[PDB]
Amino acid sequence: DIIIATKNGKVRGMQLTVFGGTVTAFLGIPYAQPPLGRLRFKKPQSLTKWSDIWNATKYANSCCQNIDQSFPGFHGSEMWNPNTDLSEDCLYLNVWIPAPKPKNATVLIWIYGGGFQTGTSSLHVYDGKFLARVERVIVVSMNYRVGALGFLALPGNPEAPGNMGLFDQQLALQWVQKNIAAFGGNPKSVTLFGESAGAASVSLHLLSPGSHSLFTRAILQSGSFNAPWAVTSLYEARNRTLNLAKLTGCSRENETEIIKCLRNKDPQEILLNEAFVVPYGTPLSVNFGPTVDGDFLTDMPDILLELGQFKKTQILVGVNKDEGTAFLVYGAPGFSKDNNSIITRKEFQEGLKIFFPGVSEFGKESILFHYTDWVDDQRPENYREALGDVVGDYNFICPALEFTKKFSEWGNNAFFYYFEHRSSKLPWPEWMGVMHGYEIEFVFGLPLERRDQYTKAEEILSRSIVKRWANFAKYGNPQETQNQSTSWPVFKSTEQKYLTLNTESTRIMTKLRAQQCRFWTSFFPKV
């Protein structure tokens, strides 16, 4: 029996057998008053002390969210849907500590993605027990509010100030500072890592002054705040808030009377209405996301990045080879996970209208012009691969690259990776390649489980990635120093070296997607 005295009370964990060893898991520790009733849409409130032994032996409720129902019964989509009950009462976190108890272990804090509308820390691919067992770090992950319940914005109004889900994250980082030493953890050695909207979240903690003292280093997988989907403007946010008010019958004149009316609405009413607050949205539609609230985020983050206004520390940043492919089968005409998705020039043009709905004809033409000059015009995959590249370069790869160049220009070490391995267990079709989100299982060491039917070469690749991530968190330097590994050079703004992650030869390359990213980063924002 394993009871720890946290600052708010005693929690009891459970014992886990992992690779002939043991991990102690604390699942579902609460870190805030449940944001219910009059607390819905507010910032999270501190938790009152309990005098019993809290039983932290099962994953807690997931936060209210809409489910991906586009492919019922398909593991490729459903692996991402919540695996606990949905509830507003969802502000809980998990802790995996090595056995026996460490003395001063580095802590890894995971922040999941999901487009800021979905996600949960209880997902199988976020199980931190392998990192605890293998690298003797402490893995922490938290649930945070998402969708309108987490990011509805009436800027300046504390009844719904925006960025509540980011403050949920922040309060959990504070829990680790106040409590993790009781678990064997070193609160002075905390590395945030996250993927997609989780990665964008991590980058925003690098800008928020309130999070500066709550972590040491940061890892950003397939995401950063300067990606076009990551920050809702004050314009759209209030137009989206106001729409939601109309759809729910809550249009009032006193701006607080609106919030009051959305608080007697059942969570389902709010959820089913989030889809329509945007007139013509995209598959990547972040209906309710981070805004410039003037509390968590003091200015527009592009300006903060550009003028060096962020925590000075090391970062590890990276992207996958085919970020853009997953989105094509959520709306692009002619695409389907159940065929090879050979699309015509006309279908490609229609696809740009889907992903760039309010962009001018000239802007859409300029995308076509940059991506439709190929070596071979007979190649029938040409338009199919071009549209995936368009979506991935615009939405993920070029913003991550630009974040890395700009962040490192202020003098910190940065490490950039290009993940190009397609999991042998990937349930999506082959033409979709190295998809968005399918490095995560390698980062968490799932292929280290010999029973799970990954190949040997994947166990090795995961084993090395896990080492490099752990060395990064522990030492600010993501090297594998023992097994004659390729040395990972720092990403400098001149040479822009990066490391490729794959099962064969890990190489050092320069200036990833240079041509494509000059278009997206220099020319396209003019249109």
Ligand X SMILES: *[C@@H]1O[C@H](CO[C@@H]2O[C@@H](C)[C@@H](O)[C@@H](O)[C@@H]2O)[C@@H](O[C@@H]2O[C@H](CO)[C@@H](O)[C@H](O)[C@H]2NC(C)=O)[C@H](O)[C@H]1NC(C)=O
Ligand Y SMILES: O=C(NC[C@H](O)CNCC1CCCCC1)C(c1ccccc1)c1ccccc1
Ligand Z SMILES: *[C@@H]1O[C@H](CO[C@@H]2O[C@@H](C)[C@@H](O)[C@@H](O)[C@@H]2O)[C@@H](O)[C@H](O)[C@H]1NC(C)=O
Ligand U SMILES: *[C@@H]1O[C@H](CO)[C@@H](O)[C@H](O)[C@H]1NC(C)=O
Binding residues for tacrine: 80, 436
Which of 92, 130, 327, 383 forms a contact with ligand Y (CB under 6 A)? Answer: 327
DSSP assignments along 354-406, one per residue: HHSTTS-HHHHHHHHHHHS--S-SS-TTHHHHHHHHHHHIIIIIHHHHHHHHH
Contact (Cβ atoms closer than 8 angstroms) between residue 314 and residue 413: yes
CB atoms within 10 A of CB 78: 16
Judged by beta carbon distances under 5 to 8 A according to partner kind, the member of ligand Z, Cl ion, ligand X, none in contact with residue 52 is: ligand Z
Tell which one of 48, 51, 52, 254 touches ligand Z (CB under 6 A).
Answer: 52
> 459 is written with which tokens?
């166990």
Closest CA to 111 of 131, 132, 128, 134: 128
- At residue 347, what is the residue type? E
Residue nearest to ligand Y (CB): 115
Alpha-carbon separation of residue 437 from 300, 335, 421 (angstroms): 27, 20, 12
> Are 50 and 8 within 8 A, CB to CB?
yes
- 309 contacts ligand X (rule: CB under 6 A): no
Q: Which of 523, 524, 525, 527 binds Na ion (CB under 5 A)?
A: 523
| Spatial contact of 206 and 410, defined as CB atoms under 8 Å apart | no
Q: Which residues between 299 and 358 bind Cl ion (CB under 5 A)?
A: 340, 345
Asked whether the bond before 100 is cis by omega within 30 degrees of 0, the reply is yes
* Residue 430 known to be catalytic: no
510 binds, among Na ion, ligand Z, Cl ion, none (CB under 5 to 8 A by kind): none
Task: Choose between 230 and 512: whose C-beta lies nearer to ligand Y.
Answer: 230
Q: Give which of ligand Y, Cl ion, ligand U, none residue 435 binds (C-beta under 5 to 8 Å, depending on kind).
A: ligand Y
Q: Which stretch binds Cl ion (CB under 5 A): 105-113, 157-165, 295-303, 367-375?
A: 367-375
Helix (H) or strand (E) holding 6: strand 3-6
- The span from the CA of 511 to the CA of 494, in Å, is 9
Annotated binding site for substrate: 114-115
Site string for ligand X, 221-240 (x = CB under 6 A): ------------------x-
Judged by CB under 6 A, the stretch of 139-147, 185-193, 198-206, 479-487 that binds ligand X is 185-193
Residues 243, 276 contacting (CB under 8 angstroms): yes
User: Is 283 among the residues that bind ligand Y (CB under 6 A)?
Assistant: yes
Return the closest-CA partner of residue 370 out of 483, 161, 482, 520: 520
Residue number, 40 or 321, with CB nearest to Na ion: 321
Catalytic member of 274, 323, 420, 480: 323
Angstrom distance (rounded) from CA 99 to CA 133: 8
Q: Kindly tell me which of 188 and 456 has the beta carbon lying closer to ligand X.
A: 188
Give me the 102-141 binding string for ligand X, x by CB under 6 A, dash otherwise: -xx-------------------------------------
Q: Is 198 in the site for ligand Y (CB under 6 A)?
A: no
What gap in Å lies between CA 500 and CA 319, rounded to an integer? 10
Binding status of residue 281 toward ligand Y by CB under 6 A: no
Residue 45 engages ligand Z in binding (rule: CB under 6 A)? no
Contacts of 337 (CB under 8 A, 6+ apart): 71, 74, 76, 329, 428, 429, 432
Residue 510 interacts with ligand Z (CB under 6 A): yes or no: no
Report the alpha-carbon distance of residue 50 to residue 47 in Å, rounded.
9
* Residue 436 falls in the annotated catalytic set: yes
Which of Cl ion, ligand Z, ligand Y, none has residue 196 at its interface (CB below 5 to 8 Å by kind)? ligand Y
Site membership for Cl ion, residue 467 (CB under 5 A): no
* Shortest spacing between CB 466 and ligand U, in angstroms: 8
Q: Which of residues 216-235 bind ligand Y (CB under 6 A)?
A: 229
Quick one: what does residue 345 bind among Na ion, Cl ion, ligand Y, none, with the CB cut-off 5 to 8 Å set by partner type?
Cl ion
Nearest CA to 31 out of 176, 201, 215 is that of 176
- Based on the shown chain and the rule CB under 5 A, indicate whether residue 369 belongs to the binding site for Na ion: no
Known binding residues are 80, 114-115, 436
Cβ distance to ligand Z smaller for residue 46 or 57: 57
What does 293 interact with, of Cl ion, ligand U, Na ion, none (CB < 5 to 8 A by kind)? none
Whole-angstrom distance, CA of residue 460 vs CA of residue 464: 6
Catalytic hit among 77, 222, 436, 480: 436
When binding is defined by CB under 5 A, the residue of 4, 32, 56, 60 that contacts Cl ion is: 60
Phi, psi angles (nearest 5°) of residue 88: -65, -35
196 labelled catalytic: yes
CA-wise closest residue to 308 among 208, 166, 407: 407
The nearer residue to ligand X, 147 or 334, going by C-beta atoms, is 334
CB atoms within 10 A of CB 259: 22
Shortest distance, CB of residue 395 to Cl ion, whole angstroms?
A: 16
CA 26 vs. chain centroid, Å, equals 22
Summarize as ranges the residues that interact with Cl ion (CB under 5 A): 60-61, 83, 86, 124, 267, 340, 345, 370, 431, 508, 513, 519, 523
Give catalytic residues, as residue numbers.
Answer: 196, 323, 436
Binding site for ligand X (CB under 6 A): 103-104, 186, 188-189, 239, 243, 246-247, 276, 279, 333-334, 336, 338-340, 342
